[PDB]
């Protein structure tokens, strides 16, 4: 998991938030894995990852990356969607299969938060005073 980075304990505040030890990151380890592969190879464009094993201390992963500017990708029409600049840094924005999962979006009753684009957007919609002209 993820221990709360605060000196000693000293999460000064209401004792709801006193927790430091038993608390857990939103994204997965696999996403973190991709994100790091993405960070390192900036030109490369993270497509997707898979698992290759796990020790007590570590996990292992295998992130498939793609050159967006290698002609064989550029000229192949079926891949040339990744060469478009909206797909810069998929992993960073929560867009690979892995980092999609944290966002908490799927069709049906088991979601509703994320019933616009995303979690943030629904909240946004739900907490707008729409103030009409005529009222």
């Amino acid at each position: 998991g993820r221990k709360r980075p605060v000196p000693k304990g000293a999460t000064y505040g209401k004792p709801v938030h006193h927790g430091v030890n038993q608390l857990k990151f939103a994204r997965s380890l696999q996403s973190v894995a991709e994100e790091r592969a993405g960070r390192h190879c900036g030109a490369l464009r993270v497509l997707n990852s898979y698992w290759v094993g796990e020790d007590s201390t570590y996990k292992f992963f295998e992130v498939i990356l793609i050159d967006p500017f290698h002609k064989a990708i550029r000229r192949n029409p079926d891949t040339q969607w990744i060469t478009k600049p909206v797909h810069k840094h998929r992993e960073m924005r929560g867009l690979t299969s892995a980092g999609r999962k944290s966002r908490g979006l799927g069709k049906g009753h088991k979601f509703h938060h994320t019933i616009g684009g995303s979690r943030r957007a629904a909240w946004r919609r739900r907490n707008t005073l729409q103030l009409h002209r005529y009222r």
């Binding site: 103030l131 002209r133 005529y134 009222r135």
Partner: protein, 52 residues
């Protein structure tokens, strides 16, 4: 603020009632003259004309 209630919305029959009321008093030379219009020498007050 911008979201002061600027616009003001009126029941439709009422809007029509007003517009009938104004028409009805576009007749009546008194109400036309009182509203200032120098209509002294005009030939007939609901003044209607050829359609050339």
């Amino acid at each position: 603020k911008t979201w002061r209630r600027w616009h003001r919305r009126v029941n439709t029959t009422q809007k029509r009632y007003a517009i009938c009321s104004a028409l009805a008093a576009s007749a009546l030379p008194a109400l036309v003259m009182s509203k200032g219009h120098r209509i002294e020498e005009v030939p007939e007050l609901p003044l209607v004309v050829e359609d050339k």
